[PDB]
């Protein structure tokens, strides 16, 4: 298989605008949302049909209860952070946890937090410790590191449980996640454009006379086209004072393409 990942996000907002949820949680497999919960619905629900079709109501009922609990815990933690920062107004709190199963069979795992969209605490599951970016985080670090069992628990979750969940979900969504739609690529400053491809991971570049020119190249973002596929571009400027061979190079899911201009 290609590299795949499972990530779960939380967002807490301390003084949200009317109607807007104080708490939102979304899980992803690769770029695909798979689950969602927020403080307005108070229900955990599938975001992909291949999640809905393979997980019974008791799964969603149980995680609905858990997320209701985790929502409250997030509120309490944010309240403590904003208290110790001595901040007024609305502030944000974020968590991201997840793992990757690499093509070569190796794994990664990660867990971190943010306050107002900036790194706050970062877990190291090898040294079993938290990296604190400032003194509010440093205080939380001491509290969280005080019981070793907590650290051991996250190491186990990240290295065993997360990867097991990922493999299970990969099988559920295989018709989506493991497919390949090759790109359609054209040249049109020279613009090289690709569209219609899946997975979104693609590498496009320009070479001049068989040499790459990285910092003369403008790299466009890989963007969702809305139909499950993606598009992207890269551009380069023409030297009108010299003749040069320009070629667009595209790599996508184990296939290389060259378009000579």
């Amino acid at each position, epitope marked *: 298989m290609r590299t795949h990942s499972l990530r779960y996000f939380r967002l807490g907002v301390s003084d949200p605008i009317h109607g807007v949820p104080e708490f939102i949680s979304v899980g992803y497999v690769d770029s695909h949302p798979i689950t969602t919960y927020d403080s307005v619905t*108070r229900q955990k629900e599938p975001r992909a049909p291949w999640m809905a079709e393979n997980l019974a109501p008791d*799964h969603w*009922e*149980r*995680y609905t*209860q*858990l997320l*209701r*609990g*985790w*929502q*409250q*815990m997030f509120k309490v933690e944010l309240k403590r952070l904003q208290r110790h920062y001595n901040h007024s107004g609305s502030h944000t709190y974020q968590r991201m946890i997840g793992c990757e199963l690499l093509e070569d069979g190796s794994t990664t795992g990660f867990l971190q937090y943010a306050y107002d969209g900036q790194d706050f605490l970062i877990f190291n599951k090898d040294t079993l410790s938290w990296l604190a970016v400032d003194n509010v985080a440093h205080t939380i670090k001491q509290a969280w590191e005080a*019981n070793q*069992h*907590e650290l*051991l*628990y*996250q*190491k*186990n*979750w990240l290295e*065993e*449980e997360c990867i*097991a*969940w990922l493999k299970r979900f990969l099988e559920y969504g295989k018709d989506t996640l493991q497919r390949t739609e090759p790109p359609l690529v054209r040249v049109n400053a020279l613009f090289c454009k690709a569209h219609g491809f899946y997975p979104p991971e693609i590498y496009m570049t320009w070479m001049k006379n068989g040499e790459e020119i990285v910092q003369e190249i403008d790299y466009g973002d890989i963007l969702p086209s809305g139909d499950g596929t993606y598009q992207a571009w890269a551009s380069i400027e023409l030297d009108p004072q010299s003749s040069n061979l320009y070629s667009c190079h595209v790599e996508h899911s184990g296939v290389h393409m060259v378009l000579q201009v």
Partner: antibody
Amino acid sequence: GQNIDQPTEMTATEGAIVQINCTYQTSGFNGLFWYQQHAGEAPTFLSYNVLDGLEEKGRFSSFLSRSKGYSYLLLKELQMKDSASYLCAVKDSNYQLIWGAGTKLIIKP
Amino acid sequence: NAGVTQTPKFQVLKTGQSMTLQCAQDMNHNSMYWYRQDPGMGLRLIYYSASEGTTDKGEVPNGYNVSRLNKREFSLRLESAAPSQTSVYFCASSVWTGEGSGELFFGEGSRLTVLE
């Protein structure tokens, strides 16, 4: 997960050592707990393991092997006051506890 | 600083009679649980409450109901007692649920005997 097993009863002598076994088969694993419950009393937390190996706390140690789905609770220098039931419990993938039926430990003075 | 306080310690009931077991915890815990303990088997969860404002069934909810009255209190109701509900009931609480390595804190137990 779906089951957890531990011997119904064990008898050992005062001053000696006893090892209480617990095996489990679960859909996923998020930690193994041991609790002590004196007859007619409340269970109380004794130990937690979640990575592999042995952890010591006073006269008690608890061991875990995740790959074998196996834990033991080791009690050293047994005293009469160790007479109690010992409950093994495993947290499954959905963080739900699954409880062993308990091991009644009898101590001969 | 009393921990988990459940009542009553003992109760005899006639089949069909109603009964409420009380449980309070003063440890500022968020999660509460009701278990029954019977000979020859492990503790079985009846209902639980992951947080203030939510509850859900456990493994053996039939014949029972619960009310998470507030953050401190979680009551267990037997609307129409049956002989099979003869058991020892344990209230328990934890700081959170599904969150790390946190253990359970148990009440003293309530012994119920239901007779025809």
